[PDB]
Write a protein that binds this ligand. Structure first.
Ligand code: HEM
Length: 451
């Protein structure tokens, strides 16, 4: 079969289609127009975007396809190096770090993180309890305060102290501005008009490198048994080697960013869908009240929040917050009986489109129905992939879910929520997705919160 392709712009081919602040949303629209697969060409490159469970299931066969670094991940790699997210599977440091850090995401590990998660969650609740009448909440902003603080404390024993700030933490400001500068630069000339951009860039890289330095120095100065403990001391059972110093620095930056941005988006979209679906809200709120019987939640009680977990999975169905991942053909192969591929050919999996495959989910794919997740074996293999695929799947999945379940459960226990502005969904795309400008009012249920 000859592959569909979107509209062209002469020698630039399809490239100008991505000249938008919302490329993933643009690609979704193209997918709706063209179907389960389409080719996308730019000068010097080609990729094929996949949207159906039938094709994506084959792309997820690790004997045939491996993780690729898309253009986006190559760019991030200048900052995240050969950390876990931006390493190739065949680089020695991938499997070494995987094996060293996997234990940091065990059950015993999650039990160990729980107390510090509650520390940050209690700060969020107290914030909202302390608002005056008729004041509102800036949802993605507060969720990011929470999730940045949580990875800093749980992972690193570092306090970002984001609830003591009206502005973003300087580390995040410097990361975003360093990423932007790196991007604007390619598209420009050593005009001394750009000497100031270069000065700002050095200062932002310094902010990042100083934080990394400080995380490491504070630990050496200090018994912890957290993510940073395993980075600094753990040995790979296979090679017998620990991580090298440079790789440790890349892991710290990778985890600080990866370990919060997508989770903030998930909590934000979950609350959005709950306020837009009051009967679902009522069910989740009822579960929180019935389960969360103590002044602060226990690990076991978070595990008991089945419906809250279904809400979170449904939010990930509709708006998976790391919405695309890339693969390459390990050898020449034919995809779906129809599309020949050569060794090295790139594929992109459009997760939001996969999650709207009517042949899997039924016709009502735009509806928010947590109940889809009530009998989990009923979800076909490779139908639901918000955490990626195979050995290159999200290492932090359990950490994200535990944090989000805890936090959303506490939110629902302690407050009633109002969509006071009748908010119109506007999804901002960065490395992640978020509902930009989402605001609510939260009226306290006046339920005491433990220490
Ligand atoms: C709802 C939250 C999250 C979502 C939707 C998400 C999604 C993803 C996806 C789709 C990948 C695969 C990327 C690819 O194939 O290119 C991935 C990888 C990764 N994630 Fe997550 N993630 C979440 C939370 C986290 C958290 C909390 C952590 C850290 C504590 C984290 C750390 C990582 C790392 C290090 C990898 C690379 C794994 C490897 O290749 O060895 N993620 N995540």
């Amino acid at each position: 079969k000859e592959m569909p392709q979107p509209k062209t712009f002469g020698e630039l081919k399809n490239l100008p289609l991505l000249n938008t602040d919302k490329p993933v949303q643009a690609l979704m629209k193209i997918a709706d127009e063209l179907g389960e697969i389409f080719k996308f060409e730019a000068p010097g490159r080609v990729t094929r975007y996949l949207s159906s469970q039938r094709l994506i299931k084959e792309a997820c066969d690790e004997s045939r396809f491996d993780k690729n670094l898309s253009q986006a991940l190559k760019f991030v790699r200048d900052f995240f190096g050969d950390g876990l997210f931006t390493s190739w599977t065949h680089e020695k440091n991938w499997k070494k770090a995987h094996n060293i850090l996997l234990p940091s995401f065990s059950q015993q590990a999650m039990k160990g993180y729980h107390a510090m998660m509650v520390d940050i969650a209690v700060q969020l609740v107290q914030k909202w309890e302390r608002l005056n009448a008729d004041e509102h909440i800036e949802v993605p902003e507060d969720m990011t305060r929470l999730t940045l603080d949580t990875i800093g404390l749980c992972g690193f024993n570092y306090r970002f102290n984001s609830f003591y700030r009206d502005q973003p933490h300087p580390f995040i400001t410097s990361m975003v501005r360093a990423l932007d500068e790196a991007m604007n630069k390619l598209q420009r000339p050593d005009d001394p008009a750009y000497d100031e951009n270069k000065r700002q860039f050095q200062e932002d890289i310094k902010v990042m490198n100083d934080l990394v330095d400080k995380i490491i120095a504070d630990r050496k100065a200090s018994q912890s048994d957290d993510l940073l403990t395993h980075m600094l001391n753990g040995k790979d059972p296979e090679t017998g080697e620990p991580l090298d110093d440079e790789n440790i620095r890349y892991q710290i930056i990778t985890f600080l960013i990866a370990g919060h941005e997508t989770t903030s988006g998930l909590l934000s979209f979950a609350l959005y869908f709950l306020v837009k679906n009051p009967h679902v809200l009522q069910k989740a709120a009822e579960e929180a009240a019935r389960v969360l019987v103590d002044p602060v939640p226990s690990y076991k009680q978070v595990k008991q929040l089945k419906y809250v977990g279904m809400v979170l999975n449904e939010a990930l169905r509709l708006w998976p917050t790391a919405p695309a991942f890339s693969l390459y053909a390990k050898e020449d192969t034919v995809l779906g009986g129809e599309y020949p591929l050569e060794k090295g050919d790139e594929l992109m999996v459009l997760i939001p489109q996969l999650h709207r495959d009517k042949t899997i989910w039924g016709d009502d794919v735009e509806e928010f129905r947590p109940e889809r997740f009530e009998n989990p074996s009923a979800i076909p293999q490779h139908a639901f992939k918000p955490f990626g695929n195979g050995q290159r799947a999200c290492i932090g999945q359990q950490f994200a879910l535990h944090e989000a379940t805890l936090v959303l459960g506490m939110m629902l226990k302690h407050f009633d929520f109002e969509d006071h502005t009748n908010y119109e969904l506007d999804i901002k795309e960065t490395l992640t997705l978020k509902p930009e400008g989402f605001v609510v009012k939260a009226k306290s249920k006046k339920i005491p919160l433990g220490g």
